[PDB]
Write a structure and sequence with these properties.
This is part of a larger assembly, with two copies of chain A (61 residues).
Chain A (H helix, E strand, L loop, with lengths): L7 E3 L2 E3 L3 E3 L6 E5 L11 E4 L14
Antiparallel strand pairs in A: 1-4, 2-3, 4-5
PDB class: viral protein
Keywords: pedv, Coronavirus, Fusion Protein, viral protein
Entry title: Prefusion structure of PEDV spike
Chain lengths: 61, 61
């Protein structure tokens, strides 16, 4: 790699404070570009090994 | 080997070899570089990203 992209990673989603979702796969990270805050405008999933982002799917969690 | 040309002290085994023509060269890597490599590998587990302003809690790695 010539470059790295710096992103705030999220362990998972604590929906209603009731149901905890996390990614199935340890090769994928759930992230937002918005580094300076605990929550953000929109969310993405990419491999940790290369930056190839996509919107999360109900089947990733 | 600065010692062995100055005959003011009797030659020990490391100089007796050198007068016999055989030189042990400095170790290929010093224990200072071998320590920096080991700490580079231990620290490289807490290196969660190149924005390295503070170390990543190891309970997350």
């Amino acid at each position: 790699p010539g470059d790295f992209v710096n992103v705030l990673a999220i362990a998972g989603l604590c929906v209603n404070g009731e149901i905890a979702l996390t990614l199935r796969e340890p090769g994928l990270v759930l992230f937002t570009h918005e580094l300076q805050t605990y929550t953000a405008t929109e969310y993405f999933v990419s491999s940790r090994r290369m930056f190839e982002p996509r919107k999360p799917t109900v089947s990733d969690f | 080997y600065k010692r062995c040309s100055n005959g003011r002290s009797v030659a020990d085994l490391v100089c007796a070899q050198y007068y016999s023509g055989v030189m042990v060269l400095p170790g290929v890597v010093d224990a200072e570089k071998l320590h920096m490599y080991s700490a580079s590998l231990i620290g490289g587990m807490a290196l969660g990203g190149i924005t390295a302003a503070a170390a990543l809690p190891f309970s997350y790695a």
